[PDB]
Symmetry: C7
Subunit: 242 residues, 7 copies
């Protein structure tokens, strides 16, 4: 810190939004242009705010339930242009020594690519061992959504209550993430292009009655809504658009 | 966070009231603006403050118990208007790892409807287990309001006192929630419209005696005092008026 | 919250006193007017402060023991006037997971009625057991005020000292509560009445010695020294009178 | 609170001193005013900071052992005067769930009389449990001041070291409390009087020897070296005068 | 603590980026100055955010597994220049008594070089023993990467899930460390140089089946992506441009 | 807590040192003055920081070990003067029940005398029990300064490590304590005098080889190295000097 | 704090560096002169910053292992000069009852000698037991760098890896301490010298071999490569030249 190293104190906005219907995945960005001209480059923080609904839906009617395996959100840009990607508040941090049920990873961010993976880490239901996005339990398969042990009603009805499950699976997950874009200032022309994906890595989960002690089977990333969204970031005017 | 990105740091109010005599629900909102020449557009903030009384009463002479299963508030709007919905604090925070008695949810918010279900999760009754909203037991059924085990007086007098139960069941739960909606600044037209379907998802607790041990039963959604009170937002005047 | 919403801005005073000799009812209403032109209303913060004396005493000698069952403050208001009860702290907060002795509840309120009940939710006597008011331990009835199990003097001189008991019951409880009232500013007539009833639920306790191993009973709600009061709110004069 | 009610804000000194020889206790007060056009009335603060030397002394040579049972500070005023006691900190607060060894209560304060008794709730001697002023060990009586169990010298020397005992007993307790008194400013007459009490309610613990296994005996509140000191505060001149 | 020393408290930016396609590690620095007539000289802060992808990737197809072991970002300057390294953070600090997975260290810093090592103190796999970077389980070898202690598919498929491992093994680790230098002001000559050797000392892990239980083998420092980068800090013009 | 009482808030320096060569006594005082147009009298602060050598040393070799039984500090003034002693930050605060090695005390401060007792409440030797200023371990005497169970060399060398023992013991202790003097401003006379004592109440601890294990004996308070310094304070010119 | 004494908190710069080759000690100082005429004298505070390398180096091939036994950095001035030593942030604080590995005590100080010894009070090797600077075991001797309880490779190769040992041993320790000096203002002559004697108390750890369990030995303070330094503190010009 500044005091820790004897440093004394060295050290215009807008709120875009959109939404996808067939997929069902909300979107938003909040940008800032504090206009201190004394800084080298224009700084822009892309708050990935939105709502990727849980889509915790029983599509198959045996009965299959589609659930969110990954709210992967990532910013990618073409090669020809001149800008670069610099920073991101959500960072893979040294896991010191709790096991949170969703692990906010950041894909290995190669220059011009920063991608978070809001993964479904080990989650506890009905007071037993937990299970993650790739939860595959030799007895209950993906043991995400078994309402009880000894159910008696219809299989399609006999799904873990969306209320009892982790609140992200039922409603969805709102990303609280940020990353930034930078380059030298004095270049003649400034513009980039982005490719957002809000990949709700959909995960088909066929729940079926096999015999006596219930059993689960799951298929990883069986579907997906790589709802590839493109934003149009207008850096000169200090506005962000699509 | 803000320091983690090494940024220097840089990125009119009123009130309302109304009550329902039949259903007994108090409703309020509060707003605030800034005249920020740097910010893009106008922002209005909706606080859901109010009092959805539990009406924890023995209406029917087991007892039928009109208790609030899940107060729910939804700020829903017609499609035709040009508005859009942005932020919904509180969000479903990553279930991080505590079992709160009312686990608030942000039901899967489409771009147009965002609605919490501040549901009734576990409640400890007379030094025993969780007993969530849909708490339902083979023998004792739901277990919200079991005054005691070995009662001896009239059953109508044998219902858990509101004082000992969760303080929300007795006297309701004041919603402490908020959200905001957005739109471009340079649009000619302004008008919007709200729904605010205040809900009190009533539910029943029937303690029926077997002659060997008490039981319970739950008639979920036996009523719903969903006193839908659509609100009116007066945006240009920088006022909110019902 | 406000940062989670990304906004940086959060979205004339006095005092009074009065006493009652018969029942010792002190009242204090330190108040505030914000002289804010950005606000379209007036606030009257009601510091619910006073001396609701414990009156822990052996009123009659066996010897009956009067003590505070439930301190309450009900800021009741006449209906004809146009005022309305907007907000209030404390609130019935979501139970989370501690069992405090005095459970500050907010009785089922309405536009006109807001009632706290500062109920007695337990105490430990001689380092054994959480004994509350609604606690009826037929072996000891309400276990509030027994100094020791094996007394040997006159019964009247064997009741729990005002010191060892929970300091609230005997020395008295001081309320720390508030509730706000609001109404539109453009009202033609500026005046509304009020009726705040300070009410302590004194509880009879005919503590008597039963000759085998001490056994008590607790007759609830014998005496209730309900004390009213009025404050005239002169909004036109920007003051509150009486 | 204030923010919880959705509001931002809205709401000349002296250092007296005095002491007494025979009783041996130190005394002092502090105050402060304000000048607000917005506020109505006038406020004042009285802090009872001082030093009441516990007199942990072997008064008689068994050897009679004087010690401070009940430190107290109590402010009382004549009736005919027009003033009233408004506020006071600390307050008898709600027990939650620790047993502090020197408890502080606020005896039932009439509008005129307010008093604390900073009670000796316990102390641990050689790590064998808690014992208050009204401690009565059936074998060690009030077992505040036994140095050990197996002494061998003159009994006048086998008394607890002030060092090991609670730091208040050895050298007294300094009150850190305060009260408040208020009145309307537009009064023709502006005078009152006070009666402080620094009643170091001592307690004879004449500690003898019973010749089988040391046995302790106490006589509660034998004397009181209650200075009963009477103060007079120079209210009118915006000062306090000795 | 300035208060502990008894004294009342008392006492231009930019950014860059560059990427390597073969090795693939992002780089970054951020600086600050004050025009302080109280400080004798200027200061720099060299933040080393960057990003070093882990390359937790199967190199040999048994099947080899390249992965990052220690991100030893170090900074060093030519001897001839008048520069000398003054301060740095983090500092090797006293370890009280937690074993954080990555034990960041500052290599023995001579006055010319200050080099941090981001080693893996220990990582936890499938809820059993911890496993350091230079961990060597004589049977399970290094233990950073084992999808299961009992697998059945192709060996290349049976390597630890990158998501399950520490979020720094799979997606790499971006250091948050910094250091500074401080040169006299009166000097006639004002330039220096730097060499920053970003490091990814990629270590191998091999699970070679022994026919009785899985057995692991590792080759310390089998490679290194010593990007061996070389920066050119433009000290003179109150920038860091290159 | 003035905020707890509903009010907003509870609304020339130097230094000296002089050394005692024989006793190794380092002594300091710090002061602060303010010209407040609101306070009634004058203010000053006396902070006895100083520093007291340990004197862990074999002055004579059982073997004598003159360790600091009691760092003590006590300002004292002549009787005739008009001054009085009022305030002091360190206090015999309620031991809110946890056994510090040095429990600092404030000896019963008369109006004239305020005296602290920085005493040895305990410390641990080779991972065993606590032992205080009067640690009278009938086995090891003062169990403070005893090396080990079975030292075999010349026991003039077998003495507890001055490093392992509590750091206050060998390397000395520095008081961090303060007190204050108060008087009216209207008096014609402006004088005061002091009588400091820094009695590092020395001790003697001497192990004793009785038969097989070790036995100890300590001649408490054998030397009181009373560095009885007679400080002088020049109040009128707002300076302390002597 | 100041509030407890009832007070409203009424209480040119530069930097250096240098280094040595053979022993490898990096030394410097940060200082601040407050430009306030208010303080009686000139304020100068010395921070002992720098890195005294570990020299955790196997010089001889057991293995003679010279390690930092204590970074006993001192500070002393010529007697003839007139200045005095007063204050220092890191004290031998009351060890206020956890035992850390390094304890940075402050030697018994004087008006001329004030020196810490950052000793190796403890450390944990491979999770079997504690081991200190005086770590000696009749078998394992010291246990700073016993890599294992058994190794099959060459002893010069068999010695704890620097990474696993406490980060201070391998790389080195950087003092973060400070110290103060004092002298009156009115003095005619205005200069003084200083003798900063940095230090690295080297110490040897050797692992002897008994052929059943390895043995260890330690040679105390074989080297004390006590580098020296005599800062030329130019107080008047407000610079610590060198």
């Amino acid at each position: 810190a500044d005091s820790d190293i004897n440093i004394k104190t060295g050290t215009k906005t807008g709120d875009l939004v959109t939404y996808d219907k067939e997929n069902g995945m909300h979107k938003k960005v909040f940008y800032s242009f504090i206009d201190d001209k004394n800084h080298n480059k224009k700084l822009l923080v892309i708050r990935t705010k939105g709502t990727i609904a849980g889509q915790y839906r029983v599509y198959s009617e045996k009965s299959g339930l589609a659930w969110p395996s990954a709210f992967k959100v990532q910013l990618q840009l073409p090669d020809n242009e001149v800008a670069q990607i610099s920073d991101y508040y959500p960072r893979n941090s040294i896991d010191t020594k709790v096991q949170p049920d969703f692990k906010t990873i950041l894909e290995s961010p190669t220059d011009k690519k920063v991608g978070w993976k809001v993964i479904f880490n080990n989650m506890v239901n009905q007071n037993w061992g937990p299970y993650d996005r790739d939860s595959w339990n030799p007895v209950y398969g993906n043991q995400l959504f078994m309402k009880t042990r000894n159910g008696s009603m219809k299989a399609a009805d006999n799904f873990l209550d969306p209320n009892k499950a982790s609140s992200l699976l039922s409603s969805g997950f709102s990303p609280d993430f940020a990353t930034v874009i930078t380059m030298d200032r004095k270049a003649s022309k400034q513009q980039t292009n982005i490719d957002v994906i809000y990949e709700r890595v959909r995960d088909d989960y066929q729940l079926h009655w096999t015999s006596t002690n219930w059993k689960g089977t799951n298929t990883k990333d069986k579907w997906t809504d790589r709802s590839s969204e493109r934003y149009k970031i207008d850096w000169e005017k200090e506005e962000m658009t699509n």
